[PDB]
């Protein structure tokens, strides 16, 4: 079963965040990412912007 | 109280359905617009309603349609919910 | 030592490699940032087979990704373990072939293949001791069916002594997502039969059928199909990366499975596979493994293996087990199914055992069977080809870009001759 | 990095371009002012809107499409409307005198003085783009200016760019309904012109969509806007594969390699499913098998043509939503098992199916509801010949007694140009019947 | 994985469909608005899941008189039924079987067949078809004949069972109803697998004698019929120690293909004012069920021989009591079975007790019985209807109303000799060897 | 070693197996989770007779469940000890036979039996040393009476040397639940007499009489009947699973109880049977056990054993006891009832002793008797069959699905000949 009511009622709601990674590697300690959360079905996605 | 608006395949009479247009919408909306009176009546037009032609009377705006549609849905459902209880329905006396 | 490189092209090749590398990464215990976090010492002794060492202690696959459109590679960059690929290997076009073999093989593919050939040559020269190449494609797409086979030809022209493996997804009419499937399939097979040292066909109809009846899962997906294909892919090369009682490299398989140089088309199978409901219910034993192995329904192809006779068979077991039981079970099966085995070549079954089982499973089995039952797919593909070719349908695109109908006639004649000579040995008697 | 350029001509063309353009803005999140919202200040990713837009560097997005008309009323309305800040001011090309349903006026008299600026604007687009996938053209054929300008644009573009792909969404006159009286003439002339100049043409007849609306949408008095919304949804679903991630993608160049077997035979017919309004949409599951059955049902057609009266060559179905490939193949198996729908002896496999993950978007004030599964089919079958035959009969009824001919004689067109169109249609009729026979 | 499709045609058909579906929705617990009140595939017997929330009954309504359809779609079940499966035409046949068989029904039967295809494509384990129709009415009779003859060639071997309401010997509303009743019987004789008697006066006597309502209505009739239907169908969707399927009627109860008219009794019928003061024993409820006055068909089982009877027992019944009651029934001399049938009893057992409806008359009982029988005594209704039709056809009364609507003059005849042949078949079967 | 598999079909067979396997699990100390929880060492030595090993140390009953409808199996899966069965052994149809022998034996069963035959062949090949097969079914249902006997014929065609056991429930004329019982009973008996090595008849009327008179319990139930049948079944094969003074396998019983190959129909009984209110006062002794095993009312068949002469008898005792007492009691019983024993074959009583009694009981007895009194059931079945068939009623049902009246005539003639030749030996004298 897929709870269809939740995706009907919460499709337009999307949360966009700005985040920085933390990792052992030092090359990718400064670069930035934009995260997106779609609460229609709890989907988590990451975008990498290149300056 | 009825329900306001009717099932699509409803034969019968829905008052001023032929007099004052209501062209374009689905059918349930027209029935609702007619059952709760939101339209001009009469063979005359005050200045404001006229000169609002299709692409100028509609096919425009933005999220105001969100607001009106949401209010219509809320009012129609709060009108409908006036029925409950573990006694089924009085269709014995409705029939 | 005796390492190989991975080369994938087209959407299907890229997506197949996407989870093949994921399965290999899970087996070898590498993190998505390239940091080793395994538990066993054997996980690092033969890591050079698929991974190159870099400064900082990280590893990179020898994978080369090609396409005439960049969308599929920009998407595989998003999948898990997609940050292991070396960015220079990504080679993409700016136009796309539009499912056209002529576009993907004559004008745009020929011009584009220069850089990818340069990088492939660099990779082949860099490695210590080259064993061969493995190439994965589908015959339902124009850019794949053209560019992949042209690169097969170019690589064969430069490395005649090395071995070549092709992972071919042929279009079957049941899962027909394109109407020009058989033009491209026949044109790709015509070039592939000449150059590919080994080819193994995979059918999406068979994949979905497996998913519904064997695993009994209601919603099969591209991910499940790719996972099954990747497990079957790793089952072949597990023994080259892990120790075993009887090692058998891809060259030994080529020696023992191909009687005649033009008969190198295979269908495979993987065991065990069961639903979550029967995982505790079932028991893992050699008889169960071999009975699920040799079941006609378990084959990775829609072709019925009981409609023909097996020319040869190859088995790769994973896990610690006695060799006597394996030998006696194979002898018992070969005695009980003598009607389905060719008679003029006795003992047409090869056995190989590796002591390292896959992660999460105690015993595993890979079957590769060369049989005459594969003729049905070619017969139906040729029937569709001649039906669509008798009225010259959709040939204006192909004739407007440099190639003519004489090549079509030659391809059809060669494919029909291949089918006839493949079925000739079925009726041969001693 | 991929782009497609849309051209609209005629008032029908402009009001269908506007109709598809609010839908594109809605599904891309574009406000009428061009900012995404004012509220969302991160952005800077998921570049897919470049399929129809181009970034200004900071802020708004501009359309990759052109509006053309010699009747400036519609362009004046558009530049007055709520989207006045969206389109470029100089990209809405408007003339002074309407052709007034005269193909001669639009092809020989007044279209030449405006087609130059049109081609200039086309070049001013083509120089900006780098991965142009192709061109789309929208034109009403029952009108002289639309037909003439479309024919002229196709003729110049076929030599200006050469091999580039063009798709034309034409709306031929009804089998027995007409809003004008001289439309057979200009329709036949335009068909003759575009036959060797368009790569693919698509049927968009009006009574078929009228029947669709009255039967499915339950709207007993629809207007043209609803038909525009349906056509807009069709083309948006068609282009969704180029801007949305899908496990089985299809490109614009993957169209006439799969639906056009001879270069002359390139007329396609489209059906959609499901078409249902909200108050009864949620009542059933809308299974993939039943939506595919409805799509292939003859009465669900957007062209007034009977597929049972003709022989099928090849069909392309495209799904958007959460569809399952093996469910698709099982539906295709049932379609093949069905008897009344038959595929030709020289085409055993005739299915071109594409899959996309993005569900269709619901439009405010529209008729359709929000669904998680949608199918659209584009078909080539021999049933096309009936509309051509009836149009030929109607045109012959007038050319027998030379009615209305002076209105084309006096505007630069010589007398004989009706002939080659007539024999062209006749030759295509024999070509259709020749293709339709088995070996 | 099992499904069945119900068709209701005519005013009587739609009115009995409402009564059956109210009982069905009550017993399955689904709300009148269609949503699950919230809390195992049993609802798949009659309903289909939309995926999330409400359900769809597998039923269709057909009528040419839109009054009843409008009443239904304005009632409390407006949200429950699909808007475009309650097919309503324009002009009623007005008791004229020819109007509904040759002039008007053809233009609506195509839409009905399309709806049947659409609903049947969803079902995968379709057991068969149930049909409800008033034969004493023109549109109901004509549409029933048309649908039966279309389905018989559209599907063939698929089972169809019809709950026909034949006219009473003396009490009737119509006067032209003998004509259309005879014509519809002629039509359905070779097109219906099982036909069930539902004459009105018998249930009238049942209600007066047992329910103790001196002034009941048609809705009480419909509720009793609904209870009978729910009993006969509960075996498919409720677990039982001895289950009986729809396919297990034409494999136990139809000795010869022509003899398929079947008559049913039920028990217990008692109001709550005295329902609890009796233990309601299985033996006495079985005796009441076979009691001739407890019959829902105005027929005398004493006047004829028995061929085959099937009882369903719902509740906490025990097979030892079942067999003990059957032994006593066989022991009684007032009921005799035909010579060539040593055993003719078929028993089914279900654990689910009947559900009581609020505002109804029947009380809550832990045990119930429904018996469906084939016996030779049915021939009297056919004989009297034959006499009723002959008295009119002697002077060709009312004939022009049928001639002018597309039928030829002689189409009454083949129905007449068909009834005659069916009769002589009944007496030929009824004699011993 | 010398182990047997279980196969059940039909609702009645499924219900019988549901209690038989529960009784076996309780005797062997097997929990419903398949985990051994017994106390004695002897409970595990010969558990391979009915249980196979799986990974994790769990045990499985190798029973194959077949039906044309899934309701009975979907209901028994949720019952106690229902998780032991492998899901792979469950095979079900989607249409049903409607109690029709034509549907159960010609149209649906012939097509459906392929999978159950495959799994039965797999199970038979898997076991170390096959002893035979046992089937439980009822003759009152069409699908069972068809599919079970067709499977019997198919299994006999493939394993002519193995032994066959059938537990047949025949529809008695007193307690009748189906109107078409005589037709399918005759059709099933006609095929069963040809192929069954041993058949044991069980009557619901006799079970109910036993429950009403001996146990004196108010409400007999199918659960109690299934428990009695399960105890009777376990009494036969107890000696093969547990040590005893004189072991006697099913083959030895076949040798010692069947004088002529066509006389293999038996009637059985179990002792002791006492009410819950009468357990103390009775003393478990060999004289009590024999006077109860030879009681007419203790028989599980409504046929009167004093209306004929016993051809042979067999008794299996459970519990530790002296053999001299058993022999002298058998001699006394044979001498005191010489009029009811055939005279031309002396010493027609076989006795076997097992040292392991049933759980909860100190001593037990299973009796199997081949006598001429079984003719009455066949006579009444044939009388009902001919009374129903003389008027060709209920016949177009069968004739429209491929059969004809000549098969019915041959079946009736064969039944009459069998009855005549069974009663012929009753009047034979030396
Ligand atoms: N479906 C649809 N068809 C339209 C619409 N507008 C116009 N048409 C068709 O267009 C035909 C006539 O051409 P028009 O679009 O009105 O005008 P035109 O093509 O610009 O040519 P002129 O009339 O000379 O200005 C009519 O026969 C209609 O069938 C529309 O909004 N929707
Ligand atoms: N038992 C029962 N009989 C009914 C009911 N309604 C109508 N009838 C019978 O049907 C007969 C007349 O047919 P109707 O049902 O009224 O109408 P119809 O069947 O739709 O056919 P037309 O008369 O042509 O409209 C009457 O004589 C009644 O005996 C009902 O609700 N219950
Ligand atoms: N295993 C698997 N096969 C796929 C997937 N997507 C498409 N295919 C198969 O690939 C073939 C089509 O290849 P195509 O995309 O046209 O190749 P391309 O033109 O090179 O991109 C079809 O036969 C599909 O069955 C997937 O996600 N997984
Ligand atoms: N002992 C016993 N007999 C049963 C049970 N259930 C049904 N029966 C008998 O089986 C007969 C009906 O068999 P049936 O269900 O038609 O067999 P099927 O057609 O193979 O499913 C009845 O006469 C019952 O006496 C049970 O649980 N236990
Ligand atoms: Mg205009």
Numbering used by the authors:
A (entry chain 6R): 410 to 460
B (entry chain 1C): 31 to 125
C (entry chain EN), F (entry chain DN): 1 to 430
D (entry chain EM): 1 to 439
E (entry chain DM): 1 to 39, 46 to 439
Relevant lines from the article:
The inner (luminal) wall of the DMT is supported by an intricate network of microtubule inner proteins (MIPs). In this work, we used cryo-EM to determine the structure of native DMTs from the ciliate Tetrahymena thermophila and a combination of mass spectrometry and artificial intelligence approaches to identify and model proteins inside the DMT.
The single-particle cryo-EM analyses of the DMT from wild-type (WT) and K40R cells allowed us to obtain a 48-nm repeat structure with a global resolution of 4.1 and 3.7 Å. Focused refinement of overlapping regions that collectively encompass the WT DMT resulted in maps with a resolution range of 3.6 to 3.9 Å (and “Methods”). The inside periodicity is a multiple of 16 nm while the outside periodicity is a multiple of 24 nm.
